[PDB]
Design a protein around this ligand. Structure first.
Ligand SMILES: [Zn+2]
Length: 177
């Protein structure tokens, strides 16, 4: 990604989150490719190979995008330059522009890395947002279910196309939960 619009230690929060998102996304891609079927099914509601392949491809693409700070297909603003953040929103993506920005509460309300199952953190919020960018992998995902219950109660095709499903799966793989 092209990191821009950064100030302070928040810049380091973002670069840490990018590097962690890359590792988490590669690890989750490996799980989708070759890991436990039941765990995959918990999040994506199927064991079918084509779905596993698509999830893995999307995650591998996210990992590559997260692995640069002056490159790739997206632009990542440390801070919202436009005023598009709404109350309680951590970050957002403009899919037609492949542009991502964090809201201020990303920095005040999230740990870098959650220790608890399904809990939000900077790395997985960043991972979530990359899935929305069609330039990373098309189609961009939608916001169909946020958090464990809403995301995992989606149907298979909605989960496949739901950003938070990827964040949740990546957290579950890392935490072994
Ligand atoms: Zn989203």
């Amino acid at each position: 990604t092209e990191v821009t619009d950064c100030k302070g230690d928040a810049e380091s929060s973002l670069t840490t989150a990018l590097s962690n998102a890359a590792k988490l996304a590669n690890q989750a891609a490996e799980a989708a490719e070759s890991g436990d079927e039941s765990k995959f099914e918990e999040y994506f509601k199927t064991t079918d190979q084509q779905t596993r392949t698509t999830v893995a491809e999307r995650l591998r693409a996210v990992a590559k995008e997260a692995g640069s700070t002056s490159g790739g297909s997206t632009t990542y603003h440390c801070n919202d330059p436009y005023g598009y953040c709404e109350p309680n929103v951590l970050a957002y993506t403009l899919p037609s522009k492949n542009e991502i920005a964090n809201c201020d509460i990303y920095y005040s309300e999230l740990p870098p890395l959650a220790q608890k199952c399904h809990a939000q953190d900077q790395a997985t919020t960043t991972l979530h947002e990359f899935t929305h960018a069609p330039g990373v992998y098309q189609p961009g995902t939608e916001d169909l279910g946020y958090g464990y219950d809403a995301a995992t109660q989606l149907s298979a095709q909605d989960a496949l196309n739901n950003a938070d499903s990827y964040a949740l799966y990546a957290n579950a793989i890392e935490l072994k939960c």
